[PDB]
Each structure stands twice: as structure tokens, then as C-alpha cells.
Curated annotation (Swiss-Prot):
Residues 9-113 form the Bromo domain. This is Bromodomain-containing protein 1. Component of some HBO1 complex composed of KAT7/HBO1, MEAF6, ING4 and BRD1/BRPF2. Component of the MOZ/MORF complex composed at least of ING5, KAT6A, KAT6B, MEAF6 and one of BRPF1, BRD1/BRPF2 and BRPF3. Interacts (via PHD-type zinc finger domain) with unmodified histone H3. Interacts (via PWWP domain) with dimethylated and trimethylated 'Lys-79' on histone H3. The chain holds residues 555 to 674 of 1058 of the full protein. It is found in: Nucleus; Chromosome. The lineage of its organism: Eukaryota, Metazoa, Chordata, Craniata, Vertebrata. It comes from Homo sapiens (Human). Highly expressed in testis.
Amino acid sequence: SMEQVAMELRLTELTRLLRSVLDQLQDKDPARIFAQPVSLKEVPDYLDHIKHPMDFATMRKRLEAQGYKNLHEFEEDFDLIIDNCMKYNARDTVFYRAAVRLRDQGGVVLRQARREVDSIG
């Protein structure tokens, strides 16, 4: 149908905007601490601690398959990155501190993303 096409064009455009959001959030991680999945070879107990691992490469795969239907779903995944780290790692670690800074800096990007998603529809 023509309606299915219109819906698909909207999804494509959301995917465009979320790709720009993702790039901006990932720039707030210049140490690349959140770039890839935590290695189960190097942290063999990780899944005993963290039930839903997440990272920027995994988000990118979902994004490029157009697997985010709305901004809420994308934000859920970004929040998993932060929250998983702040639980597994102690306050006095470079990892925890990186997550706090990513959360704080990302907030600004996400605030305007929500306005743009609503505004453009």
C-alpha cells in the first residue's frame, strides 16, 4: 500500500535522525569505553551480574536494520549502557566515571532529539 510506504519513509527518516543522535552520543565517549560489548572471554562472570548487556556497536547494528520504532526504544538501550556500567563498576573507577560523564553530556543531545522527533512527527 501507499500507507505502508509512507510509514516506511517515516521509519527511514527516524533512523536518519537516530544515526546523528548516536554519533553525537558516541563522541561523548572519547576513550571508547562503551564502543563494544564487554568481552565474556575477559569478564567471564559478566552475565551473572548484568542481564541485558549493551554497547554502541550493538545499538548501531539495531539502528541500521531500522530496529528502533521510536526514540524511547533508542533511549532504553542508551540507558542500559550507562546503568550496566554504574552497577558492575565501583564509584572510584574510570569506567563508572566515564558513564556518569556520558549520561550528563548525552542528556543535552537527547533533550533536543525529543523536541525534533515530536516537531517533525
